């Protein structure tokens, strides 16, 4: 099949164009694979995103999720973007399961960031809005755990938002692991951590 | 072409390869055109959703969606999900197009579920904010047909939701479809289910 | 290879079927790329969408989107969708960078078009809330241009939607461009419209 083999038989190139055909859709439905992929947190994150200025967040294995953070595989964890209002203040919660920081180790850290708002330029600065973050407790009829606190005017992380977050200004001993785990508040391998910033003192139409 | 067969001409298997990328591909699409269309419905029940413990719900076809009652191909019909508040009691209604029960065949039937929300543990029980269900009148001004309710603490049916949708606790004879059919309240082939579940006493921050 | 060519060899027909498989899967990756793409927007809509009467739209490459206007690639621009209420009157804005009619040219276009809802039927017409629309200032603590008005009850440009959207009846020369450009209101390529229908007097539930 000398002078004839690509002639007769060039089936060898037909069978490159087939291959090729799927590549492309190989390609595409990966590409499309991941696309799909992103749709659900765009909703997951809309389904649980408040417009009242407060917000309540859930985080599911507490156990599979606080381990990470002991072997250090993920650190600390970030809640649903929430505001103030409907084109207010853009905002949401870090937390680290594992502590950081002076309660490293020891504590649950949960701290404030100053998101970056695609409205940013028609608002007010710097943020003021007083803050309340608190720790949920699930028991028959116990208590949460509290703290407010009101932003410094001084501090780079309540400005006009430059990069994506602010920067993470809550509290880095906020409650004793000791104490979350030897209570209510974990209950069927999750918690839920709260946030009240206020908005009331500042007449939402 | 004997000791030459699978030799020369083994290409009945380079056409195996091909053939089952086609069937890997071809799941992936179908996979993917499920996953699209639960999308829809998904934007779908979110663009309806109502966080203010209000809720009008919107029933195109009923005469299609009637026929398929008395012919048993579906007897009730549910609402898109909504709220009292933006993290409160999660719900819905159910009705059935043929009636159910003691008004079953000649009345409209329409219920109040009791959904299990995602942030059930956090919220006070029984359930017990007094309910309002009405039919919507669309005509030039006349009067739609309600009737108000509050829950029983007795009753399983308003308690924290241990399976999906709590129990369907409504009115069975709620309104005579030859008082429905012969008025206003159908109009281009639809009606519209109102609900009123209380939210104002309970301070919604 | 006569009576053997289709005989011995017609895999030319086997190479027809995985041809028209791979046709079938083109279309169908095709239409989902297309599918996936009215996602996007619908989430966009949807993110940037109020309820609460008051609406804030956003404007990216002015300069892009003004140079169209004038060479007729892009007469006029409409905003996201936005209500009065979780089941009130839908609108929405429309706008021409290089203006139309009287301020043609020379001047802003800012329209208020009333939309056809979805639950227009359980509505009070003609749509009578007073507007305000409005040319958001980003300057240091300058000043917005804005201009309210109460709609006409004899023109059928407030009235219950029929076709698509209503009829825009805004302002022609609602501002100059020289104004706008010669300004802060235009900061990295893009400004924002306000608009303010009035829902406060009209008890929202």
């Given at each position: 099949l000398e002078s004839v083999d690509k002639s007769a038989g060039q089936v060898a190139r037909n069978t490159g164009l087939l291959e090729s055909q799927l590549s492309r859709h190989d390609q595409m439905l990966s590409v499309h694979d991941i696309r799909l992929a992103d749709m659900d947190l765009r909703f997951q994150v809309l389904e649980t995103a408040s417009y009242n200025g407060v917000l309540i967040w859930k985080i599911r294995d507490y156990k599979?999720?606080?381990?990470?953070?002991?072997?250090?595989?993920?650190?600390?964890?970030?809640?649903?973007?929430?505001?103030?209002?409907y084109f207010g203040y853009k905002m949401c919660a870090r937390v680290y399961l594992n502590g950081d920081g002076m309660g490293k180790g020891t504590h649950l850290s949960l701290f404030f960031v100053?998101?970056?708002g695609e409205?940013?330029?028609?608002?007010?600065?710097?943020?003021?809005?007083?803050?309340?973050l608190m720790l949920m407790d699930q028991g028959s009829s116990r208590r949460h755990l509290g703290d407010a606190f009101k932003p410094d005017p001084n501090s780079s992380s309540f400005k006009k938002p430059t990069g994506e977050m602010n920067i993470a200004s809550g509290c880095?001993?906020?409650?004793?692991?000791?104490?979350?785990?030897?209570?209510?508040?974990?209950?069927?391998?999750?918690?839920?951590?709260?946030?009240?910033?206020?908005?009331?003192?500042?007449?939402?139409?």
């Open positions: 599979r999720r606080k381990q990470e953070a002991v072997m250090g595989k993920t650190l600390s964890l970030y809640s649903q973007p929430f505001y103030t209002g100053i998101m970056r409205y940013d330029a028609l608002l007010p600065w710097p943020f003021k809005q007083k803050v309340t880095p001993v906020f409650v004793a692991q000791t104490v979350l785990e030897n209570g209510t508040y974990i209950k069927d391998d999750t918690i839920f951590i709260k946030v009240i910033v206020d908005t009331s003192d500042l007449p939402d139409p």
